[PDB]
Design an enzyme around this catalytic site. Structure first.
Site: not given
Ligand SMILES: NC(=O)c1ccc[n+]([C@@H]2O[C@H](COP(=O)([O-])OP(=O)(O)OC[C@H]3O[C@@H](n4cnc5c(N)ncnc54)[C@H](O)[C@@H]3O)[C@@H](O)[C@H]2O)c1
Ligand SMILES: NC(=O)c1ccc[n+]([C@@H]2O[C@H](COP(=O)([O-])OP(=O)(O)OC[C@H]3O[C@@H](n4cnc5c(N)ncnc54)[C@H](O)[C@@H]3O)[C@@H](O)[C@H]2O)c1
Ligand SMILES: CCCC(=O)C(=O)O
Ligand SMILES: CCCC(=O)C(=O)O
Lengths: 379, 412, 412, 379
Positions: A100-102
């Site tokens: 995941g990443k944001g």
């Protein structure tokens, strides 16, 4: 741009593993992505809205794990693409985690600490129903720090009502964080550099976050360099009191060269062992040239990932009740960095002897994911 | 491009309202958008993956509300744009509902019924944490139907363990649904079109009506409008259309679709293209299919006195201006196709109340809201904003309620 | 009938302990039992429905724990009986776990792999509200395996949205599992059998061992016991068995199963029936298949000096008495097959702790608990209860802890 | 015993509807059943454990709905079988509900009110994770009353922390219950008796719970009877002051006969319209004889079910906030009893004209369920 290269790198690797194009389509596209509108109010009453993203790429191996970057050029696709690198990296290091990443499209410089705080809080709030210690665990990235994590953390505690330390990583030590967070990548690069010379006189292009600790742990170093240069003292420089003072180095004559910060200057390095301390220290040509030249290159995705392993151990620590000592956490990084490199030595022999260690690494990354998904009946 | 259009229409009205561009920026953007990857295993073991979206545009006035469309050309941007129009539609009709919509990029025709069920279930399952009777209530749209809603429903009861009927609307009447909902949109468009004709062009009887689209909206629109004494002189679907100035038998037309695939194959009439239909001679034109079907180039050629928008977002912003310049009255979709959402508000309300609204009470509940919202729009046009088109007035009302509610909640 | 047997064994020990029949009544009965109906659609569209159970026997010492077996003869009563033995097994080994077990009435052989997945998912889904990392942690049993646990796992992550690895044990090592768990039961039975032989019959080397069953327990039991210098002179499965007094190659035996279906087809040895195997001449007999395989009629004929119970509930209560009368030592299943539950306690513990136990730390964690529990049993037998069989002593310990814990919680 | 007759009745009905045997297997077996061990402690310290059941038969049409009986002869299978009658009954009356029932093997007579209370509480507690206003809604049955519901309710409030009135039905009026609960079955039997004579001089074998109110609402009655008899006054008896005083009646001469409490005395009743006020007022022979004789029999599953409709309206009331007036609740019973009987008149014409109204009713009950399940993809 980053997306298209990541999708390309992936399809390259899928053909090499002998995978359906439909199976690679699955792996490529993220499981979920959300975008959120954040309205921030300034001191003067000025209203500004900012758009942000959480890409949850893959969770075959575990809950999404990966940091959040602030920056005025971040885009949905940069976040997704960064999702993907996290999926593969976690896979390779045998973490119980997916990718995941944001990111938020914002220039943090143009915001007060009060506005950043408010921005950081609202992001978490707008996505929390797909965050958790057992679902998605954010962390620091670019223009994001332990302070950003404390705001994340507090806002989470506000919504859920639980002091769940393990929902976020990169936390300050007094709020569920762990000590090695600073010497993680270093301890990482160092223990990889050492057992790599064993199988197969050091230089380090850098002395910041990573370089300095890479230097200390390894000596426990004929080169050093900054954005302002260094000194090729053949004695071996004093790694401590170089801190008290705060093209040549690469081409220089050593056994291991550790970039910690091209085709042209590629066929000249005299190092016969590269331990990539940062991301992208080589180019798509300069592996061609390193491979041809018979000089072993240990890539980004493994050598620099003492940090994500460090955040795993932080996560592990929180769930165990914060009992893990700094002694024991140190040993867990080295265990997790050795184990992962010995599986990448053993896969490298039994197949894909012909191939570069970057391509073989990410191959194994995808092989482990697809394998987990098969077992869960997901393809 | 629906997005682009709908954003322009919002700025048009925002500036009229005297809103800062910062405020309109907030209104413009969806609060939350999810995209999800759906993998489908064919009967032969071929793996196909499809992308869907849920756009949760605005929740000032309540939980998000609106349909899900399946289609080969659906896009993140259009579902977000369809979100927007929900917000305004729900606001104009005083429903405790924000705006949302969903979409999947798929051609249902190329999937079996077992594949579409799997597809439908995994869509819900991949977003279900941001769904709820009090969070986001989906419903049918294009290529979605009460059966879709039952797969959605059933999958949600599996995930959560609770038979909360109110999480989805447009459900079969035997699973918490309500019979009027099947035909509430068409009944709404018919009702609004008759009131509009009585107030503007001398009434609905004898009136010549072209309807583009012949699905759940268009068919029922045509049926009721025909029951009301209108002459339906043109009908069409994806396959093309037919103009018969002597009128079209609507029921028989549906039969021609059922036994043939399309309504071009209507025997008694002249086959036309969709473009030809739109600019054909008629009193009332009712786009009841897809968006952006009337634009700067065919809007000068549209022959109708009165456009009633069955579909979401049929005219571009440039088409809106031209219609204004030419004195052609357009009843906004925000009001004309609300029979859907009103019908599903009552479906929803009946679920929470425990199923105790009869089908006739419901019917009346829907027709009454529809008329009242028309009369409000009409009267409010005569008093203020009598130099603006109707969509502008409707939008003024709709946008104002929303900003009011955001103010009170301290969001603006 | 496993129920009947296991209840008799509990009364036997209860009266010895001085417990009121009212207390034993409470201990005897499961706290909660669920039966659920599972419907399966074959590839040809044939609908088959199957019944499964989850028996949650006792939760004094912690959340329920134990495996799920698939089989054509499983019954509510046997899964409840297998519940019981979990309670005692978990109590004897000081695990923060109550007793539970599951079963489905199905012949996996008559289902495809796609049918068994569907089956496995719907089982979990139909009971999942009374499952949890802190409620009920299932695991593999007969005809269930790490793949089953991965379908279970995957279905639970869909329902709840949380990747709580600790909800199921015996998981593939790549999905939160631990490598030792694959072979922890067999390693446990091998370990206990060697300690037992060293303390009773002059050690394990040279010892002649018959194992009934050659699945996950029996194969690994035989492998490790052979690594330890025992001579494995008989092996069997559902298909029947083979006695070779010169020893059996265990690995090659497994190959004969893999390429043939059964271990009767072992080339170098004498084919025997299961009954014949049980009463064949040997030093150590290890039932590692199913329950009630030794009873009042063949127990007088069993030739072994020492029975080590790999399987849950292999001897009837009447067989237990006869073995006592004849001076034949029986190591209870409550202790011998605990390598499973101990292995999955460590799998579980490692999950909550975040995956930070290495495979060797785990191995040691399991072997050590196993030996310590043996030494406790052994020493406690010599000091008190030296006129009772071992199962009685083990049961005394196990039942006493449970009643102690129920007292403190005010349940008794 | 009750099970085997219910399964038989079901397979009879499945063949008549033209259903796979595999489709009837599904319908037959309950979705879930749980059994729970209840330890109760007496005043003297005596410990007794009691076994109880919740059978959740089918939820095609909605959450399981149905009462809980206490009795020393209750068994798992009696509970299941009772599950099933509830599934079909709710279906027929077009309720948003499926079939559930519960029972405990206990003689309530042999327990103090303190022990009953404790027993009632613990049952709920041991099963609550599959109870709720939107999952499974218990009610009173035999040896169970509004008082049992208050203990159920309070214990539920203790566990969940929510005053969810609608989780249980048959509640006392001051704790979320409704007034008609007493005249529900009566209003039911009455409005069915009336509109049945319209399509196609009353007697009532009973004057208790049902008989009295059946008598009052219908007169708004040439016969009456108790466990001690009655009077065939041809005037029409005063229905009120018969309460002030607290074989022949059946065979007697009337237009409607309403059993509110066999082949031998079957061919003698002069009533040409039966409105079954209790369960099982006729036998499997005495329908043969009534059918042959051309005399219309309106069965248990519809005529007596003004009670379960009453509990629906109680449920509906709780969810609406308790605003439904007694006036409005009355009308909701009659609407729900008329609607359900007009669908059973309209199904009766278009098909199964040959067949008895009991068989046709339960046919329609199964047809509606299978139809709902098909739409949800459950068969
Ligand atoms: N009543 C409802 O359930 C509902 C709900 C929400 C929105 N709407 C809106 O009303 C409109 C009608 O949708 P619907 O529910 O009737 O859909 P539907 O799927 O029931 O029918 C679609 C109809 O439009 C036709 N069509 C499709 N593409 C076309 C094209 N390019 N040109 C011309 N005709 C075309 C189809 O052939 C069919 O006749 C849509 O714009 C939709 O967003 C309806
Ligand atoms: N290690 C584990 O996962 C585990 C877990 C819980 C319980 N157990 C217990 O250990 C015992 C062995 O189970 P398993 O996991 O090895 O099962 P398995 O399914 O791996 O193997 C079963 C073996 O027993 C044989 N068998 C089946 N029916 C038989 C019969 N009637 N007579 C003789 N042999 C027969 C099969 O052919 C096969 O050889 C069981 O009693 C089980 O309850 C094992
Ligand atoms: C009930 C939602 C209807 C909808 O999405 C629409 O009218 O556009
Ligand atoms: C981990 C559970 C093992 C089991 O069920 C058994 O040993 O019987």
């Amino acid at each position: 741009n980053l997306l298209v290269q990541q999708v390309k790198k992936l399809y390259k690797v899928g053909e090499l593993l002998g995978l359906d194009s439909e199976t690679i389509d699955v792996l490529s596209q993220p499981e979920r992505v959300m975008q959120v509108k954040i309205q921030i109010r300034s001191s003067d009453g000025k209203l500004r809205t900012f758009i942000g993203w959480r890409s949850q790429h893959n969770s075959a191996l575990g809950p999404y794990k990966g940091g959040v970057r602030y920056g005025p050029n971040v885009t949905q696709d940069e976040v997704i693409a960064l999702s993907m690198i996290m999926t593969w990296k976690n896979s390779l290091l045998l973490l119980p985690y997916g990718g995941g990443k944001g990111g938020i499209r914002v220039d943090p410089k143009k915001l007060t600490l009060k506005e950043l705080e408010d921005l950081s809080r609202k992001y978490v709030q707008l996505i929390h129903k797909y965050l958790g210690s057992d679902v998605d665990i954010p962390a620091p990235d670019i223009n994001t720090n332990p302070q950003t994590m404390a705001w994340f953390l507090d806002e989470y505690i506000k919504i859920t009502g639980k002091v769940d330390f393990a929902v976020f990583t990169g936390k300050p030590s007094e709020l569920g964080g762990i000590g090695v967070r600073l010497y993680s990548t270093g301890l990482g690069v160092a223990t990889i550099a050492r057992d790599a010379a064993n199988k197969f006189r050091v230089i380090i292009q850098g002395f910041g976050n990573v370089g300095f600790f890479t230097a200390k742990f390894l000596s426990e170093i004929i080169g050093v360099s900054d954005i302002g240069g260094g000194v090729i003292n053949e004695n071996g420089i004093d790694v401590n009191r170089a801190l008290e003072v705060v093209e040549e180095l690469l081409i220089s004559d050593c056994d291991i060269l550790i970039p910690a910060a091209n085709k042209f200057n590629a066929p000249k390095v005299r190092a016969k062992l590269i331990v990539e301390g940062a991301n992208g220290p080589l180019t798509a040509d300069a592996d061609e040239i390193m491979k041809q030249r018979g000089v072993i290159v240990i890539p980004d995705i493994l050598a620099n990932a003492g940090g994500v392993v460090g955040s795993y151990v932080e996560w592990a620590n929180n769930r165990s009740g914060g009992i893990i000592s700094d002694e024991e956490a140190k040993k867990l990084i080295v265990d997790r960095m050795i184990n992962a490199f010995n599986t990448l030595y053993d896969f490298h022999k039994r197949k894909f002897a012909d191939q570069d260690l970057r391509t073989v690494a990410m191959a194994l990354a995808v092989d482990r994911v697809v394998g987990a998904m098969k077992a869960r009946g997901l393809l």
